[PDB]
Amino acid sequence: AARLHRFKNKGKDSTEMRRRRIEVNVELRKAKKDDQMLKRRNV
Amino acid sequence: MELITILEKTVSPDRLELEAAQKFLERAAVENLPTFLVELSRVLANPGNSQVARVAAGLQIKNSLTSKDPDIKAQYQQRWLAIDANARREVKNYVLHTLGTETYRPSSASQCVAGIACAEIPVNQWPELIPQLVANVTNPNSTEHMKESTLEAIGYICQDIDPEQLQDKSNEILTAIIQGMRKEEPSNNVKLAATNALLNSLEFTKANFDKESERHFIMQVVCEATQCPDTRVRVAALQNLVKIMSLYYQYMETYMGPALFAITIEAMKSDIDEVALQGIEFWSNVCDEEMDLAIEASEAAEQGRPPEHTSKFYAKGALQYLVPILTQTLTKQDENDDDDDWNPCKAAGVCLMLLATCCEDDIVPHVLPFIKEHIKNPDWRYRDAAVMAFGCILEGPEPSQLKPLVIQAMPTLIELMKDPSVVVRDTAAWTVGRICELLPEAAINDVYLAPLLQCLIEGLSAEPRVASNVCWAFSSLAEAAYEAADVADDQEEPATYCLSSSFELIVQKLLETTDRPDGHQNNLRSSAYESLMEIVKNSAKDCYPAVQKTTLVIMERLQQVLQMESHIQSTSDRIQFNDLQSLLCATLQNVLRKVQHQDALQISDVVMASLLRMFQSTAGSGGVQEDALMAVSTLVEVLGGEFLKYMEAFKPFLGIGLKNYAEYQVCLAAVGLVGDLCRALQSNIIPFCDEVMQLLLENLGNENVHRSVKPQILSVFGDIALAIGGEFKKYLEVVLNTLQQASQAQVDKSDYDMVDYLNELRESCLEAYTGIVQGLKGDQENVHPDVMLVQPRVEFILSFIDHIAGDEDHTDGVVACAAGLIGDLCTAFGKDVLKLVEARPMIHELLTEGRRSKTNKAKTLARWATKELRKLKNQA
């Protein structure tokens, strides 16, 4: 079809930014999980 | 009444006739499918009927036979095959004789041919179809209409029906289409019909691709067909040639020079739009597949294996004749610039941008003379491409050697941000925006920072099309500053950096631009809000009063949202409201994570009430509440163990969140919320555990939910036991049975989607076992007597990872938690598991590759697993 998602900054939509934000949050959730767990286990 | 008149009325301009005809045809098809279709086929087969009626009959049968939604089409296929063979064969007689009796350039019956065969081919009840079509094309006495009608039907056959059902009959069809593809054909319409049908059937022509003589025969046609005087044949042959390149790049080497590359350059010189576009599209795919092959080459190089596929560096040996023409056609812009239509002007940039990435550092000398010479042109046309091509080549070359060019052109860029040409200022905004993201250090230089920064602030007050492009520059500039701030200012959080001097000025300007009435144009509001999210997220310690003021301001913005839920009169208004509510809630996450614990107390009550009412404000539109509850979790992540003040006023909302069973995202976020709740509330979640656990087990039994949510549901079982301790015994028996059942499920290895799906599924299974083992273990004392409840299951748990260790798909995440679980199991019993582990040597090789695993957490769990294994052996 059309690859219009590469013309300067037209490939930055409301839905596109939504998935970018949530994947950051879950990694922080992942990071906070192990960091809390690792500190209680051993250095 | 006569059905011929019905076919005329469905095209006549009368609303009442259309619904009456549609109702009668739909009712008759359901009432008597076989007889009515036979009657319809009889009428259309007659050449004496009016062409309008025949077209109407063709589309009506097309609508009944096929649709847009695959599920509706699939059940229609099952309905058709249930019809008796004589009735099915009766319409086959008329349909195969209807073609060639219509003077219309498209064939109405061709769509009908596709629909019937959608169910006939899988059941193979019409085996004489394919041989019949071959004879029609090969017949020299056939008329022009009959030739093209058969070819048109052929294209529909290979476009709608699944490719697997046509794998066997590829040889016969290809023989027919080539016969009608000969350049000796006088009629041009036969050529384009053959060209369109040819490209639709390139996915199962590999059975004919293996023969080099046949392969040379097929390409002999398209190379000669490209030179056809008709413009439609020119693009169609090239368009077919584009798809040929996309698939069979491994064998196009022998003809690229003598036959292929000569046409593409010539086709790219055309003053017509499509001819130059398809040629540009062709060479873009060459670089694109070169990159993917380069990825495969990079994948094989590190592993040491020979590359299964190898490229030939076409892009490097063609940019000499590609850049000058591409740059020349890059200046074909228009005064009435619009972003709605794809045009060769914008098509030029993306192909040039793709070429720069593909050839990496071999595009710098071919473009610098053009930009340096036309950057001072009196007309904006040449200055537009002089700066646009500068940004389009910023990616791919290494930054250090590109520094001398960008540093000297920066003083020109700011002046170019002031010329009266609207397009150049819009173009310059992207270039400075691109240069900030890709070149952090160059974008921040005090000799040019203050003039550049002042231009950016003044720039956003202009037309929205240039305000949108500069907002992302502001956000990237802050991120570039942060990457330079942590190195210089402090180590864990910046205190005061360069942008801090103008930080308080720009942040309120971003608040101002969000209030502009033209925020919808070029997604201005979403651009500013995202820019506002990043600039607040990246601040300095001296900016605490600045972020404090906007925190109050955004709270007042929430107050504005409170009293506007009754202003919905149009659907688009709700859509913007849906977008607006998501942005503010997302912005709440950034500010709540960048404030002081004391400052959070005052805003806790107002936000909690605001979040509570906003959850219930959206009775429908489940998308917005997906962001709501995760925003609520962010409050819990920072507030601490003081959230019990609202727990009694949160259970019905938490309960109904898991009671959806329709949307997987909300419950996927909901299981995160309860995980976040227990992770902070610690042992105060005991009275609330009974309500969620009973409902949570119900989700396990129901299989109507999405497959993706199941591992996350199993993920929350382990952690809740870690908080309460040894009070989970009342639910321990139930979960193990579900854990037993879930671990029993297995699937084959044929489709990579479900192959990697089970990897994360068994990954969730491992961590669930870790939580209950750690939960009953307590805090510091020895093993509790509760460990005997899971004692009989440890053989099964070790057996489950025995199969995982025996597998060869694997995932770095899976191998990590398994090693961590072993340490927990070793702590659980020790000597008891020693006999169990010795009977399973596959876990020994599964832990040795843990050392191979590059992920650090895999290493930490790997050393954790082996250190306790030695202690168990050294226990006695």
b/e sequence B405-430, b meaning 16+ C-beta within 10 Å: bbeebbeebbebbeeeeebbbbbbbb
Listed in sequence order, the residues at least 6 apart from B510 whose beta carbon sits closer than 8 Å to its beta carbon are B471, B474, B528, B531, B532, B535
- Percent helix, strand, coil in chain A (nearest 5)? 70, 0, 30
Q: Choosing among A3, A6, A9, which should be mutated to test the B contact, i.e. which has the most B CBs within 10 A?
A: A9
Report the alpha-carbon distance of residue B763 to residue B768 in Å, rounded: 9
Question: Which tokens in the block code for residue B566?
Answer: 């009754």
Cβ count near B29 (within 10 Å): 17
B43, B109 contact by CB (below 8 A): no
Which phi and psi angles does B332 have, rounded to 5°? -95, 30
Contacts of B366 (CB under 8 A, 6+ apart): B319, B320, B323, B324
Cα–Cα distance for residue pair B798/B846, rounded to 1 Å: 13
Q: Name the token pair of B337.
A: 């610039």
Task: Give the max Cα distance, chain B.
Answer: 100
CB under 8 Å to B694, separation ≥6 — which residues? Answer: none
How many Å apart are CA B326 and CA B351, to the nearest integer?
A: 9
d(CA B434, CA B470): 10
Q: Which tokens go with A30?
A: 């992942």
The two most distant CA atoms of chain A are separated, in Å, by 54
Hey, what are B209's tokens?
């691709």
CB B160, CB B118: distance < 8 Å: yes
Q: Angle at CA B665, nearest 5°, toward B659 and B670?
A: 55
Distance of CA B271 to the CA centre of its chain: 35
Q: Nearest C-alpha of chain A: how many angstroms from B346? A: 7
Spatial contact of B589 and B631, defined as CB atoms under 8 Å apart: yes
Question: What angle do helix axes A14-41 and B524-537 make, rounded to 10 degrees?
Answer: 20
Give this entry's resolution in angstroms: 3.7
Q: For residues B36 and B56, what is the distance between their CA atoms, to the nearest angstrom?
A: 15
Say if residues B501 and B444 touch (Cβ distance below 8 Å): no
Length of chain B: 876
* Torsion, CA B762, CA B767, CA B768, CA B772, rounded to 10: 150
Residues of A in contact with B864 (CB under 8 A): 41-42
Q: Inform me whether the C-beta atom of residue A15 falls under 8 Å from chain B C-beta atoms.
A: no
SS3 content of chain B, % helix, strand, coil (to 5): 75, 0, 25
> Look-up: residue for tokens 């020994």?
B844
Q: Name every chain B residue with its beta carbon within 8 A of the beta carbon of A25.
A: 589, 630
> What is the per-residue DSSP string for B520-579?
TGGGHHHHHHHHHHHHHHS--GGGHHHHHHHHHHHHHHHHHHHTTTT---SHHHHHHHHH
Pairwise CA distance, residues B664 & A20, whole Å = 18
Task: Round to whole Å and give the CA distance between B593 and B584.
Answer: 14
Report whether B440 contacts B487 (CB < 8 A): no
3-state secondary structure of B754: helix
Extract long-range pairs of B321-325: CB within 8 Å, 24+ residues apart. B321/B265, B322/B265, B322/B283, B322/B355, B323/B352, B323/B355, B323/B363, B323/B366, B323/B367, B323/B370, B324/B366, B324/B370, B325/B265, B325/B268, B325/B269
| Residue B256 DSSP code | I
CA distance B555 to B549: 10
Residue B373 burial (CB count, 10 A): 11
Q: Is the dihedral of CA B62, B63, B65, B66 positive or negative?
A: positive
In A, minimum Cα distance to B473 occurs at: A9
Q: Supply the Cα-derived Rg of chain A in whole angstroms.
A: 18
Count CB neighbours of B328 within 10 A.
13
Burial class (CB in 10 A: 0-12, 13-18, 19+), B232: middle
User: By the 8 A CB rule, do B865 and B822 touch?
Assistant: yes
Residues of A in contact with B637 (CB under 8 A): 32
Give the dihedral of Cα atoms B364, B366, B368, B371; nearest 10 deg.
Answer: -130
- B chain contacts of residue A42, beta-carbon cutoff 8 Å: 864
Rounded Cα gap, residues B118 and B80, in angstroms:
10
8 Å CB contact between B793 and B742: no
Dihedral sign, Cα of residue A23, residue A24, residue A29, residue A33: positive
Contact B126, B120 (CB under 8 A): yes
Token duo for residue B577: 């409201």
Q: How much is the CA Rg of chain B, to the nearest whole Å?
A: 34
Q: One-letter amino acid identity for B18?
A: L
Q: Cα–Cα distance between B2 and B867 in angstroms, integer?
A: 88
Question: Six-digit token pair at B39?
Answer: 């009657």
B347 and B392 in contact (C-beta within 8 Å)?
no
Q: Are B599 and B612 in contact (CB under 8 A)?
A: no
What is the Cα–Cα distance from B280 to B266, expressed in whole angstroms? 11
Question: How far are the Cα atoms of B233, B256, B382 from residue B317, in angstroms, in the given order?
Answer: 28, 12, 27
Question: Pick from B658, B654, B676: which is nearest to B667 by CA?
Answer: B658
Residue B160, amino acid: D
CB B166 within 8 A of CB B204: yes
Which two tokens mark B647? 């727990």
What's the rounded Cα separation, in Å, for the pair B669 and B709? Answer: 10
Residue B658 sits at φ, ψ, to 5 deg, of -80, -10
> Taking CA B756 as the corner, what is the angle to CA B753 and CA B759, rounded to the nearest 5 degrees?
150
Question: Quick one: DSSP state of residue B849?
Answer: H
Give chain A positions within 8 Å (CB) of B630.
22, 25
CA B249 to chain centre: 25
Please choose, from the candidates B788, B808, B794, the residue with its C-alpha nearest in 3D space to the C-alpha of residue B849: B808
Place of tokens 């794998």: B167
- Report the alpha-carbon distance of residue B91 to residue B115 in Å, rounded: 12
| Cα–Cα distance for residue pair B298/B395, rounded to 1 Å | 19
Q: How far apart are CA B191 and CA B183, in angstroms?
A: 8
* A7–B339 C-beta distance less than 8 A: yes
CA distance B762 to B759: 5
Mutual orientation of helices B752-777 and B812-828 as an angle, nearest 10°? 20
Q: Which residues contact B531 (CB under 8 A, 6 or more apart)?
A: B471, B472, B474, B475, B510
Residue (of B278, B270, B378, B268) closest to B319 by Cα position: B268
How crowded is the C-beta side of B709, counted as CA atoms within 13 Å?
23
Give how many domains chain B has, as a whole number.
1
CA distance B439 to B791: 58
Q: Give the residue among B266, B358, B349, B277 at the shortest CA–CA distance from B312.
A: B358
Phi, psi angles (nearest 5°) of residue B583: -65, -45
First-last CA distance in chain A: 53
CA distance B56 to B75: 23
Residue B298 DSSP one-character state: H
Supply B788's token pair: 């005997």
Cβ–Cβ contacts within 10 Å for residue B690, how many? Answer: 11
In this structure, which amino acid lies at residue B667? Answer: C
Q: Which domain holds residue B275?
A: 1-876
Residue A29 neighbours by CB distance under 10 Å: 16
Whether chain A has a CB inside 8 Å of the CB on B664: the answer is no
Q: State phi, psi for B339 to the nearest 5 degrees.
A: -95, 0
Query: Half-sphere exposure of residue B63, counting CA atoms within 13 Å on the CB side?
Result: 11
Nearest CA in chain B to A43: B860
The dihedral region occupied by B124, where left means phi > 0, alpha psi between -120 and 50, and beta the remainder, is left
Q: What is the spatial distance between Cα B580 and Cα B583, in angstroms, rounded to a whole number?
A: 5
End-to-end CA distance of chain B, in Å? 97
How far, in Å, CA of B375 to CA of B371, rounded?
Answer: 6
Cα(B93)–Cα(B874) distance, integer angstroms: 85
* Cβ atoms B621, B577 nearer than 8 A: no
Q: Which residues of B269-284 are buried (b: 16+ CB within 10 A; e: fewer)?
A: ebeeebbbbbbbbbbb
Q: Which residue is associated with the tokens 């959070």?
A: B600
* Phi, psi of B772, deg, nearest 5: -70, -35
Measured CA angle at B732 (ends B731, B733), to 5 deg: 95
CA distance to partner chain A, nearest, from residue B237 (Å)? 17
Tell me the residue ranges of DSSP E strands in B561-696. Answer: none
| B871 HSE (CA, 13 A, CB side) | 13
B274/B270 Cα distance (integer angstroms): 9
CA angle B441, B355, B338 (to 5 degrees): 85
Q: Could you tell me the CATH number of the domain that includes residue B734?
A: 1.25.10.10
Mutate to test the interface with B, among A5, A8, A26, A39 (most CBs of B within 10 A): A8
Measured CA to CA, the distance from residue B415 to residue B285 in angstroms comes to: 37
Yes or no: say if B91 and B41 are a contact pair by the CB < 8 Å rule.
yes
A31/chain B closest Cα distance in angstroms = 11
Please, are residues B385 and B374 in contact by the beta-carbon 8 Å criterion?
yes
- Elucidated via: cryo-EM
Instruction: Show me where the domains of chain A are located.
Output: 13-41
Q: Measured between alpha carbons, how far is B342 from A3 in angstroms, rounded to an integer?
A: 9
Q: Minimal Cα–Cα distance from B814 to chain A, Å?
A: 15
Three-state DSSP at B269 gives coil
**Residues from chain B contacting residue A30 (CB–CB below 8 Å):** none
Interface of B with A in 320-339 (CB under 8 A): 339
Tally of residues, chain A: 43
